[PDB]
Amino acid sequence: QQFGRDIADTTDAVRDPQTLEILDITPCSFGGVSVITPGTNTSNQVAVL
Amino acid sequence: AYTNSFTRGVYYPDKVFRSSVLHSTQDLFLPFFSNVTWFHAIHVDNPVLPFNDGVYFASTEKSNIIRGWIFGTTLDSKTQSLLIVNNATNVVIKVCEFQFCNDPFLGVYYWMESEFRVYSSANNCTFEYVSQFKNLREFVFKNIDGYFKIYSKHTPINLVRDLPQGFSALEPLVDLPIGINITRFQTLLALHRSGWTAGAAAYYVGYLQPRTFLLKYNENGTITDAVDCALDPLSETKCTLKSFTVEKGIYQTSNFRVQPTESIVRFPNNLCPFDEVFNATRFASVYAWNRKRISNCVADYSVLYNFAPFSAFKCYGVSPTKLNDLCFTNVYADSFVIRGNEVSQIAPGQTGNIADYNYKLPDDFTGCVIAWNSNKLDSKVGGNYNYRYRLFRKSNLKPFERDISTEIYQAGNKPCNGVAGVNCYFPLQSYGFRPTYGVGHQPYRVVVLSFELLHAPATVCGKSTNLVKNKCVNFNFNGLTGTGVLTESNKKFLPFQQFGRDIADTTDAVRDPQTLEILDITPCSFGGVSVITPGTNTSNQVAVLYQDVNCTEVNVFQTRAGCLIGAEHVNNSYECDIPIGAGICAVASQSIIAYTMSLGAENSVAYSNNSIAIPTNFTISVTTEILPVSMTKTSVDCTMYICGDSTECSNLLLQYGSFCTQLNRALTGIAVEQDKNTQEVFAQVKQIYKTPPIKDFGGFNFSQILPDPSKPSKRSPIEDLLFNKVTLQKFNGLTVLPPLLTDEMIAQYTSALLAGTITSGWTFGAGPALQIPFPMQMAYRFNGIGVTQNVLYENQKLIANQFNSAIGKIQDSLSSTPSALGKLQDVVNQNAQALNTLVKQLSSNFGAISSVLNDILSRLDPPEAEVQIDRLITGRLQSLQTYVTQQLIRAAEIRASANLAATKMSECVLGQSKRVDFCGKGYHLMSFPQSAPHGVVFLHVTYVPAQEKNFTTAPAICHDGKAHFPREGVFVSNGTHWFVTQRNFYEPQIITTDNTFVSGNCDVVIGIVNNTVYDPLQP
Amino acid sequence: KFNGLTVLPPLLTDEMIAQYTSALLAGTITSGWTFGAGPALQIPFPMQMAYRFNGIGVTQNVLYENQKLIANQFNSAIGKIQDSLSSTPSALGKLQDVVNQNAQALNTLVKQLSSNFGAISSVLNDILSRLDPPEAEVQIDRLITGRLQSLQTYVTQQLIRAAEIRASANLAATKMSECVLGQSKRVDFCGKG
Amino acid sequence: GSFCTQLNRALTGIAVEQDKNTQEVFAQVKQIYKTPPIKDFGGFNFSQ
Amino acid sequence: RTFLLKYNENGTITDAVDCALDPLSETKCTLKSFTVEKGIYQTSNFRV
């Protein structure tokens, strides 16, 4: 085997050349950015989730 | 001979590693249980077999008689050949031109290898490679795109002969870029010296075929099992469901349609008058060449080669055959006589006496010229002076010009006054043909065909097949091309109508040429094929249903649903277990039986005008109602999902408008709606009610529904079992927002509702929770269902025992019956399947050169790559829009279910509902809510009559002339005395004035009996 | 059903649905609501109607004193039901409407095959025959995009109509359980009055 | 891809849903009840 | 002109509607029926 696939059609692991070892490939972190705000009247101070 | 392949010939399709997943791929595979040609090396044998797509080679031996294989096209020194050999040192793969012997082999001597008789010469040697019963060798040899692949497997097995019944996946062991075609295969054997006597071994050859295989990978990645989709309907069903084990049910796997057996072409049943032209008795002189216009006719230009005799013809446009396909508005036939040596002038681009002054073709002529010697007809002894040709003219003729003037040609400056004389010449000369002239000077008749194509219908053109009836055929009626069965028709077509059209533009009928009969075109029989199976776990027996197919196309049974085979039709009816359609359902007696469904057991009630049935006894039944409340709060990112980490696709996506904002907002709306649904169904209590530490509920036991402190999640055994029964990942652009309410918090809400209903009855729903003893609350509920509270108090122990027994049984039923939580599992499965399909659609090309965006961006320049990237962008946008629409509809269904669950919690748990069957079958007593993943389970406790007794009944009692009617309940007569009892329980009481009211007299009420109404005041 | 379409027969036939309806009618006229609750208890129909009168807050005696008048009114109303159904066009429109909508959806879907969607011709065979591979594939793709969009629109509209029919069927099942299998005290759920 | 497979799956789902709708609406009786042979219903007529 | 032709069982055109003759004919053409039921029907769009 040269590279591994998940249950879905995505690559989960690869056999790294130059060392013949197994490297797990994780989709690097991403996410939505939400803003906690009490309202412009209440405060301009906000938090970022 | 031929042996059974069993389940062998499966190899790893690629170097891709898969763990615990089923993968379906279409490659060259050896079909399961196929006939494999097996040969014995010993003769009391290595024939040359073809290679075709691939070869599966099996070897059962102990002395290694099979040492090698030979592949090639001619298997000789003439062409390059592939040779794999094992000379007891290493496996040698040589692509060279070898001259193999008629029986090439490796002669082993007394043991040591001594003779190598596989080849005599090596030529060109384009490729060379060296690699370093009780046993089984399995090999798969394939040649694709110039790469030759060898898959190998060693399996020690003890068997007398034939392949073992064991599944082994063949790991690829050699992959070589050979580059040459392989059409023939020959094995190499090790000849044992005694004169040769080969060892006793079996070598098996199985040809690979294009097959679709579903392979089951394990956690290690080994292929532990496989399914051949084309082997049988059950395996095709396993392939369709993408699962090795299928549950009982109907499954549509593929479609059966009958292909047309043969093609019929129908064309109308007058010939162009070419006989009148070529075989005319007289021909014109060339100076007065004749022109015949041909039109409105069909001509056979194939036989131009024989339109006349001893002809000589040449076409300057396309071949005479192609003239037969072609059509033209007009054809012109020019004809005349000239000398043989002048025929060469009747060609484009020629000059000469004839071309210049008699008959002139254009430089761009595309027609045909035909000429034949006419000496016998046009020459005469003494001279034929009829034929003339112009010798003088002041200018050349323009193409197709004709000049028949006979003015005296004035060659000098003196006038000719209309008479021939010196330098004044008559312009025509006769050929004076005589039979004794040389062939160059003999007469030739000439026909020139020119083909005009102007702006008008082509009325001059250049097959008819026998009609077949009631057979699926591809028909061509005067250019109408279609497929279907042609049958007799009763439609009276008007004479001008050629084909009949049914509503919505369908070709229903056509009138045939040469017969004028109207034939109805019924579309060829097509229908899905459904598979009746009791489930692979129960049995591998399978029935097949062809939908909407008559039983005339390949036990059988014809139903309105179609033709069903493999199940026996049985007259007697049973309850349906598998649906087929048309009122027919189908496993019994170790076979599949098809029967008409029985709607119910017949039960006629013994109605009588004076008879009643009163329940002398009752039972408490607990039923689960499982309702989904929410779906996984999935969220997609349109920009990332459609255009992956590339600016180029992002710029183009921005040209499509606010589609990605609309889709994202729609998914956000469904996620917020899911949170609102869960909050609405569970958070119906202003306060969190806590059950008392002492479970003194008058004998009622709630241990199965009250939360268990020992468990590390405050969940009751029933909801813990529900969580354990239902069983459920990071993608690109796809995330799952967690629910606003945690499972622990939802369970706490359910526990609070359960404590509130247990302690305060329905009062906590109305307002402040007012404590009331559970037996007294049960008495109020019994009064609510029309049963006097004394009935519960007299039977409190019996009711508590029944309630505990039912509560135990319901947890047993939930733990023992699968698909009880199937409604909750279905929504989770549907969400997961939609997500899986959406991720799978990323690998769809949608007409692009490649599915992956990086490849199409890297290999193509942006001016051309933009259209391919646009095809992918539009395809992914359409796919995401479809997924969002499916999710929106599914969320609407989930919201309706959640609204129903909220209403049921408000009316069945927070209160006692008099709505029939709204909170479970029977008179509703109460309901207990239980949390479940994305759902709520309602345990409806209901009162059901158990023992029924007949009683003679009177609407009223006649006492002293007055009619008495029961204030509550009905009058009953056990046969000696009359009594008054509640309708839902048999508790007879003496007729008194306090339980009966007097109305009117006895001469108005119909069907009343006389009795004594005991007045309590009288004694 | 001539253009790749199919109409699967209903699992319950006309006669079997009629048999279910007949069983429900017999249960109501012989046991009142007791058959819906559980075992069918034989009940005199005048007495069952008397208790149904008691259920709406009218004493049982009023029915017995007026049994003949109630029976005459009930028979007259039942007779008027046939006249109302047979003499009012569009009375069955609520069912004919869905039947027509499904028929119209199928008719438009098969009429969309006659559409070109910008291709040189609607017919696939002639354009495949008269066009070379690298432009015929573009025309075929354009037709496939148009036909798939038509099929998806039809499928989505059918799904929405199926959701509407699912809601109507849920209401019908609830009405069968509350009005037919029992007596409903929620006003206007089972008719005015 | 499986666009038409999704469409066919959805249509199969709606067909099964129609079957379920009819079964839920009409099959609300465990056993088929038969009307008594004599119509002695106290003057009420159910022949229609 | 656009004409709605009524072909009988014989295929003979027994009646026709001129879709532009009058608003009633426009309604008949829009409904694709020779008889229109009582009600309001949208036939075309008026633009200046």
Ligand SMILES: *[C@@H]1O[C@H](CO)[C@@H](O)[C@H](O)[C@H]1NC(C)=O
């Ligand atoms: C903000 O809060 C104040 C007081 O709580 C209220 O009057 C006002 O309507 C709110 N909204 C805005 C936009 O000021």
Ligand SMILES: *[C@@H]1O[C@H](CO)[C@@H](O)[C@H](O)[C@H]1NC(C)=O
């Ligand atoms: C067609 O020609 C055949 C003989 O060639 C004749 O039998 C048949 O009647 C003709 N059909 C017509 C003229 O419709």
Ligand SMILES: *[C@@H]1O[C@H](CO)[C@@H](O)[C@H](O)[C@H]1NC(C)=O
């Ligand atoms: C097969 O069904 C039987 C009962 O019919 C059950 O006991 C068994 O666990 C089932 N096995 C599987 C693998 O589903």
Ligand SMILES: *[C@@H]1O[C@H](CO)[C@@H](O)[C@H](O)[C@H]1NC(C)=O
């Ligand atoms: C189906 O086939 C049977 C047997 O050949 C025949 O009797 C029957 O009429 C056929 N039905 C149709 C609709 O063709």
Ligand SMILES: *[C@@H]1O[C@H](CO)[C@@H](O)[C@H](O)[C@H]1NC(C)=O
């Ligand atoms: C009523 O039925 C229950 C359960 O079948 C039984 O235990 C009880 O003894 C019965 N009571 C009478 C009075 O028949």
Ligand SMILES: *[C@@H]1O[C@H](CO)[C@@H](O)[C@H](O)[C@H]1NC(C)=O
């Ligand atoms: C309720 O039933 C459970 C069954 O395990 C038992 O352990 C428990 O003691 C019972 N509770 C009462 C109050 O009897």
Ligand SMILES: *[C@@H]1O[C@H](CO)[C@@H](O)[C@H](O)[C@H]1NC(C)=O
């Ligand atoms: C009927 O009831 C009376 C009074 O309770 C009783 O004496 C008699 O034995 C009962 N008869 C039968 C047949 O049950």
Ligand SMILES: *[C@@H]1O[C@H](CO)[C@@H](O)[C@H](O)[C@H]1NC(C)=O
């Ligand atoms: C019931 O019908 C019978 C005839 O079968 C009659 O004799 C009796 O008086 C009737 N009783 C009532 C209560 O209507």
